[PDB]
RNA sequence: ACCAAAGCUAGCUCAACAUACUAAACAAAUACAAAAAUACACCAAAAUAAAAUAAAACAUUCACCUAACAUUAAAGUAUAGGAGAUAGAAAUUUUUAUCCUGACGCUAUAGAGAUAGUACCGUAAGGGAAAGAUGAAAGAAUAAAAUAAAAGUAAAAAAAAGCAAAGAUUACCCCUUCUACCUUUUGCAUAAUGGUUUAACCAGAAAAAAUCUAACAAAGAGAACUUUAGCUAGAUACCCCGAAACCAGACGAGCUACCCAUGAGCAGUUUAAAAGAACCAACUCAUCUAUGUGGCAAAAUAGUGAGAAGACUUGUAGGUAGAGGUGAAAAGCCUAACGAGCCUGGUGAUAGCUGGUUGUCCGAGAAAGAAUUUUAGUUCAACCUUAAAAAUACCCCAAAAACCCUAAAUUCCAAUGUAUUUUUAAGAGAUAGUCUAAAAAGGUACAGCUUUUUAGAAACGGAUACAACCUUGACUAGAGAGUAAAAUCUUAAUACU
RNA sequence: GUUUACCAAAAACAUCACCUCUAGCAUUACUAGUAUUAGAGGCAAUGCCUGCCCAGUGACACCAGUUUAACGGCCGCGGUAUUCUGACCGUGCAAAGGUAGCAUAAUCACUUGUUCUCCAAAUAAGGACUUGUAUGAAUGGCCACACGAGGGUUUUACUGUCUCUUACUUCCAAUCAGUGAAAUUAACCUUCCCGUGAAGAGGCGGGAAUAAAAAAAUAAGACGAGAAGACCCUAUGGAGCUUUAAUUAACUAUUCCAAAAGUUAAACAACUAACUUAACAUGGACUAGCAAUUUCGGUUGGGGUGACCUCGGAGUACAAAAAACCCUCCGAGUGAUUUUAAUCUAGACAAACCAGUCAAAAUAACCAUAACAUCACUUAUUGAUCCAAAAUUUUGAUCAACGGAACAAGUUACCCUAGGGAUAACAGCGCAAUCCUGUUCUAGAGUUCCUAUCGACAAUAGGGUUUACGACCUCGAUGUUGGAUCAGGACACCCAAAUGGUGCAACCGCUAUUAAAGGUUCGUUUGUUCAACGAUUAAAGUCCUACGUGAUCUGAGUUCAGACCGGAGCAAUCCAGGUCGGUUUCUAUCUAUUAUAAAUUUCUCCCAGUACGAAAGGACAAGAGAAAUGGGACCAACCU
């Protein structure tokens, strides 16, 4: 412990304290850096490299439509809504090497990523989930043990609306009239022949959407999953059905 | 008391790179309160009278004849009053440039 | 051989459960001055906790702090703050019965304070102990049985000379060689601190980052997270005693200060007089001196003094209470310490200040640049330690670095002799300095003086003694050897006829 | 009469008396009172008195104005009577300019003012003089009776206080018997000297000494025991007190607005407002009282006072850099001007951090390949975060203690705690400026003549008394002035002895050498050491010893708590200022120590009124005696 002084007695001052000269961490001026950080949106990145590697080893299967829950279940990605993760974003890291044909749904995507999926004859769509929704979507089985109905999917807030309304982004709220046009525009720009998705045998799976108000595939807002009996329960009431279906 | 405020730190004026050293463009060669060393070839002068290298190379010091700019009154007067054989000398710093200016490479054979 | 020594029990501690939570005992007596059968009333009540402390001061602020809502997370996040110290949510999430209750808890200085809230100490509130050891049987005491080991003594006083020993020696001394130990310091044999001695007690505690070991690995974790080799687990860490104080609430006026009630004393002499007159007892004070100074006494004894019908002395019962009371102000007195009582609680107050800090051996190893209500302290550098990566590291010849005059010398660098240096990751101490040689400044061209710069040193050898001068790359054993520095310094002389 | 129970009994307090202020009144104080009363105070009976001032600060009057027996104040410079003075004159400033009295005082210093009285002699006491430029009139001024365990002085008397001690009793004491404590204690096998050393040694070095043990005595040392120094400083430690410190509540009174209860007109002019208020009593303000919370920046050759605290240039720091001082010297806290001086970025300087500095290329601006604002020594002309104002992009600190607490002063001798010999006062040590000694040199003084006696300007060396300087030992204590007692030592000799020189005739002297066995008085005043004075002496030495000596004494003085006076301060309090008063403990463990002698000096009488001298004067040696002191003894008488 040394000898006498403040240190041998155990009393030396707190951490930032410099001995009375104005502390370093306090002489520097305040500036928004971390300003409003808790409210920023966070999209966990997923490269085409990892997606391909996941398909190749048969963690996710390209056969059925790939959404967030499928990515989570393959542990290809990890989402923590508590940290304001709003979902997966698709990045182009493996674009040149990406040979798989998929129906994929992510919450953000880059032009190059999209192009890279189109070239192989698949379909990309950007969908939005609110925090509560997202939480339920990533970990469904713990939600079904909760004993609650399946909540409505919320809309995007005013900031994110212009993103999800554009066919540019293949937004889930976009006008499908614009889709083939923009989709072709991509193929002009990156110089590849755009396949006709219509004439494919898996096409029925490729067109599959969700309702903008719906969390899962083939379930509906307001149902209740009884997992011990392997039954679904649906409201017959008029008010309930009006509320959940609005 | 009578005497006050003699206390100020040293300015660290001096000569940073020495003859024969290697320098990269922008290195400060020397720094000074009055002109002691004058800038020579490839050596820029700062507004505080400090010398810095304009080219990558080797520092050399030299004595040379001093012919002041005719726009400078004082120096011209000093030169004009000299006896007819006399020549002002001063000490200069140069950088002998090391790398060749650039090279010619083969891009494409058409 | 005395004094002594040794037991293993009494009980305790922490949890679990649990019904549910003021035990036991009540014949009489108990709230008259508790323990006293019996007479016309009264009876009752509430007002935010504060401060010590942290902020290195202190003024807003300062978790917990005698108010049920737990748990896994969200999260030390949003927010709140002399926007400082610090403080700090929620939405939203998770939680499967009952039995398997005991103990890597203590064993008489421990564990409860406890054989006991008793003795004892306080007027009171309140404080608060110590203590036990035979055996199956003591309805086996001319008594039988296993330690005889602490300091203290006895058996047995001492015989020149010296930190009490050590080398030794046929031999105890005599000889030779060594300036107790801690702490504190620039420096201690110091005549600086502490200790009579013995036994028993008596003081380093935390896992953010890191390192080490291992699992699994683009993933890992028995949910909530983290991830561009990571994740998970384990292991590695940060003392003890001490103020004057401050705040709240109790208890104190049987001492003493001043009051209120109610009693009691004041003889002789002098005076028309009981006149804050006079002399002088009882009585009350406490002047001066000597004793006494662990005393007869935590304020007395002997003599000597001052008042002695008064603003006098004094008994009994009652009152005023600490931010207060009382005061013919001495800041006096308020239960032997009153510039503001005492006790309990806040409390393990807080101390940059002093003291202390417990096995062995080995590797390396530190004297100060900068800020600072700072110079008794911190936090940064520079050094240094432990790991780890590298590549140059000192040494360094020319050449080179200013203008009037200017020294010893610096800077910078090949070669060459060496093996060091730099980065990376961890980490503290230290930052109150002495003398010697040199360059200067101040002073008295004084200081064992003071302030900087370069160098050195801090022997178990030498300078008799010795910190700093000189010799000397500090290992173990030997009844070998060679060397080093080093031990008395010289002169002391004036005839001129 | 009262007071600090336990260091102060007093000049402090109270007090009769005299004065100010505040009140016109009812069931718990005052008071069962009613202004001839009752509270809050001042001052101190009596007597003579109580002068001038309302500018400041208070308090009344909520502003004017009034108040000093409210806090408090009460001056100069120049010129004048033949001369010192200054009735007079001039002029400045003030709210008034200290009046009467008293006065070297309990009154800053000068001060032991001057003079008279008292004493043989007085820094004492008393009486006068008195500018006290710092007295002074109810924070009272002057006389006075009586009184006082108050403080000073004289006379008588008395005495063991003293010269100068003595005898004897009792208690203690020592021995025997019984019982049986305390502080204390590293271990001790516990000598002396000189040296040394954390600067004062039983323990180190060099020497000396030395059978072992009790018992009784003394106190020089064990920096002896006691109490974590009360002095001093430090601590971002306390507390008490005072305010003109900074923040401001509650409470107590004032004033006001609102609340609450009301009341009036049906208002006025031409063709809604205003006013009211018994006691309670709420919310918000105002002014005071009484208070609450908190603080005393640092550096400093100890603190305090003074000075300083940031930035730059030169020296210190001679040639790369850096480099201190309460070191030596200059500066800065900005002007002036127009060339109004952009954006972005390689690489560097500097550097603990924060801050500072340069700068290529590239863009854009402009001649259409157009980026250093300039001058004043150019270097310095400056300030972080937060927070406030601005709205687009900025601005704001003698935050000058200049790395900056958002906002806080005094004082403590009533003090407290924690520490410090890191830092003062005492003593030691260092040093030797100051001080003291010698020698060296002679210009000069000495009628002439340097050195009989001196000796400027200077020189060399020593001593270690003084005042400092330094801060090295001691702050878990090294108790401090002068006396008393006992003295140990030096010699730099005051006396006694032996001599040299004289501007030595003799007697005196003045010098110098040698010598340390023995001596070195009694009184008046001062606390005093010094010093003055009276009387003497053979002489009344200079010093060292912790300014020897308090476990032997003293306590007058300094240095605690009380109190006056002058002064400073708004006050609390304060002054190297006076004055009165004020607790001085220790049973000895260790060291050390505890009786041989073998004189010393004066003065008489002779020597002789000789030697010597003009005379006045007047010796040495030799020789006889007496005393005194000191050492050692003793009672026949005297005396006790
Ligand atoms: N001048 C100045 N004052 C500041 C600043 N920051 C805080 N303050 C403080 O803010 C307060 C403003 O109130 P003030 O006393 O000026 O009326 C002051 O205490 C002042 O010292 C600043 O940046 N500049
Ligand atoms: Mg220590
Ligand atoms: Mg220290
Ligand atoms: Mg994530
Ligand atoms: Mg300078
Ligand atoms: Mg400097
Ligand atoms: Mg604090
Ligand atoms: Mg602290
Ligand atoms: Mg404090
Ligand atoms: Mg609190
Ligand atoms: Mg705020
Ligand atoms: Mg702060
Ligand atoms: Mg017990
Ligand atoms: Mg017990
Ligand atoms: Mg024994
Ligand atoms: Mg021996
Ligand atoms: Mg010291
Ligand atoms: Mg040290
Ligand atoms: Mg030593
Ligand atoms: Mg000593
Ligand atoms: Mg000793
Ligand atoms: Mg010492
Ligand atoms: Mg001591
Ligand atoms: Mg000792
Ligand atoms: Mg100490
Ligand atoms: Mg000490
Ligand atoms: Mg100790
Ligand atoms: Mg002791
Ligand atoms: Mg960890
Ligand atoms: Mg450790
Ligand atoms: Mg407080
Ligand atoms: Mg405090
Ligand atoms: Mg009573
Ligand atoms: Mg009578
Ligand atoms: Mg009488
Ligand atoms: Mg008596
Ligand atoms: Mg008598
Ligand atoms: Mg009597
Ligand atoms: Mg009498
Ligand atoms: Mg009388
Ligand atoms: Mg009573
Ligand atoms: Mg108080
Ligand atoms: Mg009081
Ligand atoms: Mg009384
Ligand atoms: Mg008084
Ligand atoms: Mg007093
Ligand atoms: Mg008491
Ligand atoms: Mg503590
Ligand atoms: Mg400190
Ligand atoms: Mg060392
Ligand atoms: Mg500061
Ligand atoms: Mg460090
Ligand atoms: Mg060279
Ligand atoms: Mg090299
Ligand atoms: Mg320090
Ligand atoms: Mg020194
Ligand atoms: Mg050195
Ligand atoms: Mg030796
Ligand atoms: Mg060595
Ligand atoms: Mg060696
Ligand atoms: Mg008394
Ligand atoms: Mg009394
Ligand atoms: Mg009296
Ligand atoms: Mg008395
Ligand atoms: Mg009086
Ligand atoms: Mg009158
Ligand atoms: Mg009078
Ligand atoms: Mg008057
Ligand atoms: Mg007035
Ligand atoms: Mg007026
Ligand atoms: Mg007179
Ligand atoms: Mg006087
Ligand atoms: Mg006056
Ligand atoms: Mg007055
Ligand atoms: Mg007066
Ligand atoms: Mg009378
Ligand atoms: Mg009298
Ligand atoms: Mg009297
Ligand atoms: Mg009296
Ligand atoms: Mg007799
Ligand atoms: Mg006996
Ligand atoms: Mg002996
Ligand atoms: Mg000695
Ligand atoms: Mg010896
Ligand atoms: Mg010896
Ligand atoms: Mg003694
Ligand atoms: Mg002594
Ligand atoms: Mg002592
Ligand atoms: Mg102390
Ligand atoms: Mg003292
Ligand atoms: Mg004091
Ligand atoms: Mg400090
Ligand atoms: Mg404080
Ligand atoms: Mg004020
Ligand atoms: Mg407070
Ligand atoms: Mg101060
Ligand atoms: Mg200071
Ligand atoms: Mg000083
Ligand atoms: Mg000094
Ligand atoms: Mg000052
Ligand atoms: Mg550098
Ligand atoms: Mg350019
Ligand atoms: Mg400062
Ligand atoms: Mg500063
Ligand atoms: Mg600075
Ligand atoms: Mg601060
Ligand atoms: Mg006093
Ligand atoms: Mg103390
Ligand atoms: Mg010292
Ligand atoms: Mg020191
Ligand atoms: Mg003393
Ligand atoms: Mg002195
Ligand atoms: Mg002394
Ligand atoms: Mg001294
Ligand atoms: Mg001493
Ligand atoms: Mg000398
Ligand atoms: Mg002459
Ligand atoms: Mg001396
Ligand atoms: Mg000196
Ligand atoms: Mg020193
Ligand atoms: Mg001391
Ligand atoms: Mg001692
Ligand atoms: Mg003598
Ligand atoms: Mg002599
Ligand atoms: Mg003679
Ligand atoms: Mg003598
Ligand atoms: Mg002396
Ligand atoms: Mg003395
Ligand atoms: Mg004395
Ligand atoms: Mg003594
Ligand atoms: Mg005095
Ligand atoms: Mg008296
Ligand atoms: Mg006195
Ligand atoms: Mg005594
Ligand atoms: Mg004895
Ligand atoms: Mg005795
Ligand atoms: Mg004769
Ligand atoms: Mg004749
Ligand atoms: Mg005789």
């Amino acid at each position: 412990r040394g000898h006498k002084g403040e240190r041998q007695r155990g009393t030396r001052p707190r951490l930032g304290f410099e001995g009375g000269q104005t502390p370093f961490y306090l002489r520097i001026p305040k500036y928004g850096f971390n300003e409003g950080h808790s409210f920023r949106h966070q999209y966990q990145p997923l490269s085409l490299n990892r997606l391909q590697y996941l398909i190749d080893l048969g963690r996710v299967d390209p056969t059925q439509p790939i959404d967030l829950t499928q990515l989570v279940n393959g542990r290809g990605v990890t989402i923590q809504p508590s940290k304001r993760d709003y979902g997966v974003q698709l990045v182009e890291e493996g674009a040149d090497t990406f040979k798989a044909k998929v129906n994929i749904e992510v919450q953000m995507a880059s032009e190059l990523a999209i192009a890279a999926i189109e070239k192989n004859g698949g379909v990309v769509t950007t969908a939005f989930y609110d925090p509560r929704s997202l939480e339920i979507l990533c970990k469904p089985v713990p939600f079904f043990l909760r004993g609650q109905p399946i909540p409505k999917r919320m809309l995007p807030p005013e900031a994110l609306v212009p993103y999800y309304t554009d066919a540019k982004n293949r937004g889930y709220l976009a006008d499908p009239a614009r889709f083939p046009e923009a989709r072709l525009e991509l193929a002009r720009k990156y110089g590849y022949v755009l396949p006709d998705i219509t004439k494919d045998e898996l096409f029925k799976m490729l067109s599959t959407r969700k309702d903008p108000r719906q969390i899962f595939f083939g379930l509906a807002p307001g149902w209740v999953v009884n997992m011990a009996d392997k039954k679904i329960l649906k409201p017959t009431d008029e008010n309930l059905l009006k509320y959940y279906s609005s | 008391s009578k005497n006050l405020g003699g206390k100020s730190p040293g300015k660290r004026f001096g000569i940073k790179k020495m003859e024969g050293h290697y320098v990269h463009a922008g290195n400060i060669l020397a720094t000074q309160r009055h002109f002691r060393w004058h800038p020579g070839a490839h050596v820029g002068l700062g507004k505080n009278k400090c010398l810095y290298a304009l080219e990558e190379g080797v520092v050399r010091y030299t004595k040379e004849v001093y012919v002041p700019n005719p726009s400078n009154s004082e120096a011209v007067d000093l030169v004009t009053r000299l006896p007819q054989g006399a020549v002002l000398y001063k000490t200069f710093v140069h950088v002998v440039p090391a790398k060749p200016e650039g090279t010619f490479k083969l891009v494409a054979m058409l």
Side-chain angles (χ1 to χ4, degrees):
Chain A
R1 290 296 232 100
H3 180 240
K4 282 178 180 184
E6 209 161 11
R7 58 192 96 199
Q8 206 228 332
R9 315 239 169 70
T11 353
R12 57 158 97 250
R14 58 181 197 272
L15 233 192
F17 187 76
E18 296 202 336
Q21 129 208 72
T22 292
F24 156 76
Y25 74 100
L26 294 188
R27 43 174 39 247
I28 301 308
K30 286 185 165 195
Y31 176 80
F33 266 132
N34 311 121
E35 178 62 89
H37 82 276
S38 172
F39 308 111
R40 299 198 199 110
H41 289 211
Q42 291 208 17
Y43 301 97
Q44 176 76 218
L46 173 59
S47 81
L48 290 171
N49 260 0
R50 182 150 179 79
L51 182 71
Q52 176 70 91
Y53 160 81
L54 282 169
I55 290 178
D56 269 341
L57 297 191
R59 298 232 224 131
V60 295
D61 74 307
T63 317
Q64 291 194 8
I66 293 193
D67 75 316
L68 203 33
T69 297
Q70 288 319 290
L71 294 184
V72 165
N73 279 15
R75 345 283 168 146
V77 98
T78 287
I79 309 288
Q80 35 254 346
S82 75
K83 296 314 172 200
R84 273 76 50 184
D85 276 25
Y86 271 88
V88 164
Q89 81 159 317
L90 229 192
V91 250
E92 54 277 359
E93 250 284 273
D96 307 340
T97 330
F98 179 88
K99 299 238 180 164
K101 183 172 173 184
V102 231
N103 173 230
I104 245 267
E105 169 184 309
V106 298
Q107 345 294 331
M108 260 181 43
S110 171
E111 263 197 24
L112 190 40
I114 303 184
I117 291 201
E118 298 312 315
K119 187 184 173 178
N120 294 79
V123 160
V124 199
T125 157
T126 39
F128 171 81
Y129 294 81
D130 82 85
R132 191 195 172 187
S133 295
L134 191 60
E135 153 54 44
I136 302 150
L137 173 68
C138 290
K139 297 202 173 193
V141 179
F143 166 79
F144 288 145
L145 293 177
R146 203 161 297 173
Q148 312 187 351
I150 296 181
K152 321 169 55 178
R153 188 160 109 188
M154 286 303 100
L155 288 200
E158 297 195 12
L160 291 185
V161 146
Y163 184 85
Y164 291 113
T165 345
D166 281 2
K168 264 277 188 175
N169 311 293
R170 315 308 165 80
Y172 81 121
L173 285 193
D175 167 31
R178 311 298 190 203
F179 256 56
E181 165 50 49
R183 165 211 217 61
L184 221 165
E185 198 42 61
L186 224 52
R188 321 230 82 167
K189 178 175 167 180
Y190 295 80
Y192 60 107
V193 173
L194 164 55
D196 337 336
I197 333 91
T198 340
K199 302 174 184 176
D200 256 325
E201 29 174 304
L202 277 171
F203 167 78
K204 254 160 191 174
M205 177 271 320
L206 280 162
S207 336
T208 310
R209 279 286 179 274
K210 286 178 190 172
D211 249 272
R213 276 269 145 101
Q214 185 190 10
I215 304 303
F216 293 96
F217 277 132
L219 300 183
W223 296 6
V224 158
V225 186
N226 176 13
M227 298 219 298
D229 304 333
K230 312 236 168 185
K231 307 264 190 180
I232 316 302
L233 308 179
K234 313 162 189 167
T236 328
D237 190 343
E238 283 192 2
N239 286 337
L240 259 51
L241 281 172
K242 207 160 225 167
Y243 169 77
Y244 284 135
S245 202
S246 67
Chain B
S1 53
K2 301 212 298 182
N3 294 136
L4 287 180
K7 348 193 295 177
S8 82
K11 263 54 211 66
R12 283 110 239 252
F13 293 140
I15 142 182
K16 312 310 193 182
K17 297 306 180 85
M18 210 85 30
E19 152 103 8
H21 278 294
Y22 201 74
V23 285
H24 301 274
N27 282 350
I28 302 206
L29 302 187
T31 182
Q32 57 195 332
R33 174 144 36 227
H34 309 283
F35 288 89
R36 169 172 173 173
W37 316 277
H38 300 97
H42 303 290
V43 167
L45 174 66
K47 45 201 208 70
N48 57 38
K49 306 175 221 179
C50 91
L51 319 178
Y52 60 93
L54 292 159
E55 304 284 338
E56 163 159 332
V58 182
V59 179
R60 300 288 184 194
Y61 290 78
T62 291
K63 316 295 188 189
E64 271 171 272
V65 300
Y66 170 72
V67 187
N69 181 37
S71 299
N72 176 4
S73 67
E74 298 195 357
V76 169
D77 293 344
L78 168 64
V79 131
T80 270
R81 287 176 267 149
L82 297 163
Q84 262 220 340
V87 177
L88 250 296
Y89 276 83
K90 300 288 190 171
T91 299
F92 291 88
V93 203
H94 324 275
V95 182
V96 176
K99 308 279 191 182
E101 171 63 52
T103 329
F104 288 106
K105 288 294 177 183
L106 174 64
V107 175
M109 223 181 51
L110 301 184

